[PDB]
Amino acid sequence: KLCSLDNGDCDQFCHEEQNSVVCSCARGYTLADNGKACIPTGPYPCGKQTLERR
Amino acid sequence: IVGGQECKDGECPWQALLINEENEGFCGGTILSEFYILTAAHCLYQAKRFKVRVGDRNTEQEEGGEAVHEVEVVIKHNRFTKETYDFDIAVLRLKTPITFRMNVAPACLPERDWAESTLMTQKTGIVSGFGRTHEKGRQSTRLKMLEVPYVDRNSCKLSSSFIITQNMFCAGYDTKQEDACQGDSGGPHVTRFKDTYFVTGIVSWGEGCARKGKYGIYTKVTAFLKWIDRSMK
Numbered sequence: 001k002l003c004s005l006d007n008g009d010c011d012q013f014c015h016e017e018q019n020s021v022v023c024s025c026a027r028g029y030t031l032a033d034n035g036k037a038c039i040p041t042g043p044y045p046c047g048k049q050t051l052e053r054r
Numbered sequence: 055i056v057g058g059q060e061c062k063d064g065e066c067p068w069q070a071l072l073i074n075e076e077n078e079g080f081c082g083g084t085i086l087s088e089f090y091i092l093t094a095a096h097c098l099y100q101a102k103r104f105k106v107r108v109g110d111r112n113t114e115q116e117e118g119g120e121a122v123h124e125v126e127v128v129i130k131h132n133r134f135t136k137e138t139y140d141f142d143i144a145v146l147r148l149k150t151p152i153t154f155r156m157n158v159a160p161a162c163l164p165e166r167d168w169a170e171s172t173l174m175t176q177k178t179g180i181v182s183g184f185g186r187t188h189e190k191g192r193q194s195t196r197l198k199m200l201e202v203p204y205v206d207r208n209s210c211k212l213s214s215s216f217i218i219t220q221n222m223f224c225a226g227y228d229t230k231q232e233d234a235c236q237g238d239s240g241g242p243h244v245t246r247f248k249d250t251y252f253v254t255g256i257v258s259w260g261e262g263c264a265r266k267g268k269y270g271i272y273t274k275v276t277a278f279l280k281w282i283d284r285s286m287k
């Protein structure tokens with residue numbers, strides 16, 4: 001119910017909106033069906049280290 | 055970077071390096087997208103002409119993933135001045151787009167209110183660069199990174215011989231000999247949140263490097279998120 005506790009369970013951005021928690025994501029991610037997770041739409045989403053060889 | 059460690063493979067993929075007429079690094083940048091680099095406005099006055107190199111980890115070794123791009127447009131903040139070092143921010147539009155790959159990927163721009171409440175409130179951020187390894191030292195041929203504690207604004211102001219504006223924040227250590235330094239300016243300060251790195255600062259200035267009772271001063275990116283958005287339009 002609050003962004004101040006585990007980021008409202010959001011992977012990325014959290015806001016308390018119309019008095020309710022809403023999650024969102026950076027460009028290059030799509031908010032998951034569960035309304036919490038951020039799913040990269042491409043192989044090099046922003047903010048991810050390039051740790052595996054493609 | 056003074057102290058810290060070499061950045062491991064793939065671990066600093068948003069690092070860019072501004073290279074002068076001579077292929078010598080003088081400032082960093084942060085990759086924001088295929089076309090845009092974030093840097094410090096003050097960097098623009100430190101070389102007449104320059105290009106941007108991405109994907110580099112070792113300036114003395116051709117790994118094969120490096121690429122050099124020319125700058126098409128310089129977007130300097132109109133209120134930057136050398137007198138104050140205030141508004142120390144510039145965006146670069148590249149002539150040709152970056153191809154994201156191993157060691158080459160953008161850092162995320164956060165949303166302002168969340169950045170202020172959740173990122174700037176973290177214990178530490180991460181600074182990186184090819185700059186000097188101690189104040190009077192030579193620049194690093196290997197890319198380095200450093201975890202730097204966020205420092206209280208009141209403490210920041212009291213420590214400083216120069217005005218600390220709301221467009222600036224302090225990070226680093228009081229006496230511990232770790233800091234950014236000459237050559238790192240313009241480069242990334244990023245803050246990790248659940249395995250995703252968000253741009254939170256631009257390496258800006260400091261009274262020396264890693265001096266006792268002085269902190270690293272960084273451009274407060276949360277103050278410029280709308281400005282960045284417009285510059286990238």
Ligand SMILES: O=C(Nc1ccc(Cl)cc1)[C@H]1CN(CC(F)(F)F)C[C@@H]1C(=O)Nc1ccc(-n2ccccc2=O)cc1F
Binds near residue numbers: 139236237257
């Ligand atoms: O780059 C530096 N330090 C550094 C940089 C970033 C971070 Cl995060 C940590 C540390 C030092 C190293 N240089 C010394 C060298 F090269 F020997 F290493 C001078 C440089 C500097 O910034 N001088 C400097 C001092 C003061 C001001 N300043 C600030 C506000 C208003 C006016 C004003 O001039 C501007 C500066 F660039």
Ligand SMILES: [Ca+2]
Binds near residue numbers: 111113114117120
């Ligand atoms: Ca190299």
Ligand code: NA
Binds near residue numbers: 228230266269
């Ligand atoms: Na210090």
